[PDB]
Amino acid sequence: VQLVESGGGLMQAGGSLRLSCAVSGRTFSTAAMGWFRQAPGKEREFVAAIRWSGGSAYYADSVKGRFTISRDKAKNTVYLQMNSLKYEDTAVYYCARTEYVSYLLSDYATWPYDYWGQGTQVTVSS
Amino acid sequence: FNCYFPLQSYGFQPTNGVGYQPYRVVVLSFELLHAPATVCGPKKSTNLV
Amino acid sequence: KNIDGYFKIYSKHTPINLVRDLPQGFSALEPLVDLPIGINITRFQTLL
Ligand SMILES: *[C@@H]1O[C@H](CO)[C@@H](O)[C@H](O)[C@H]1NC(C)=O
């Protein structure tokens, strides 16, 4: 199982970028997908999660009203629409996947995920 | 809040307690309709004299 | 025929030369199949 991220790169502040993460290889089931980010010298930090079934989304406070997570089940792809970009959003963004089904969506903020992408750089300029 | 997913996963690990370890279960239920009984046992035969 | 859930199928094959009707004569049909279907039947059709 591989998570293949794409999109992102350089964008001026106030702009919008979309990240993609495609799941390849034989999967039994997917419970949830998530986006995390790691800014230089800082800890990796939760951004957003989406339940595969139903598509309910959970967001870090820092990205509420700005970022949207979405899923295309048929393409086995998760997306992060990153609107109103700020310098603070500069980081390597990581896709994550789990087969762990929690009744409680907020658990996806703190759950250790099983599968990780390679990371995609987002750089926000002036 | 007050809106949860009805399902939750099992924590099945090799090191888990016997109580928490997985167990495969088969329940055999028998039916008798207004129809012929097509599921019979062996009723094995003997020698001929 | 269909009796007490069992589908009884009897059959018989013969050579003939009749281009019009059934040949007049006498011959009996041995059973071939007994299906425990347990299915109601009131209509049927043929497939050619
Ligand atoms: C089968 O036919 C019987 C005889 O008319 C009737 O009482 C019964 O309702 C039918 N059952 C089904 C499965 O329709």
Q: How many CB pairs under 8 A join B and C?
A: 12
CA angle B39-B43-B47, nearest 5°?
A: 150
B39 interaction partners in chain C (CB closer than 8 Å): none
Minimal Cα–Cα distance from C13 to chain B, Å?
Answer: 30
Resolution of the solved structure (Å): 4.2
Which chain B residue's Cα is nearest to C40?
B35
A101 interaction partners in chain B (CB closer than 8 Å): 5, 7-9
Secondary structure (H, E, C), C1-40: CEECCEEEEEECCCCCCCCCCCCCCCCCCEEEEEECCCCC
| Least CB–CB distance from B8: residue in A51, A99, A103 | A103
Q: Please answer whether residues C5 and C38 qualify as being in contact, where contact means their C-beta atoms are separated by less than 8 angstroms.
A: yes
Q: What does the longest C-alpha to C-alpha distance in chain C come to?
A: 39
CATH fold of the domain at A2-124 = Immunoglobulin-like (2.60.40)
Tokens standing for residue A70: 């979405």
Tokens standing for residue A16: 């919008």
| Determination approach | cryo-EM
Tell me the domain boundaries of chain A.
2-124
d(CA B15, CA B20): 10
Gyration radius of chain C over CA positions: 15
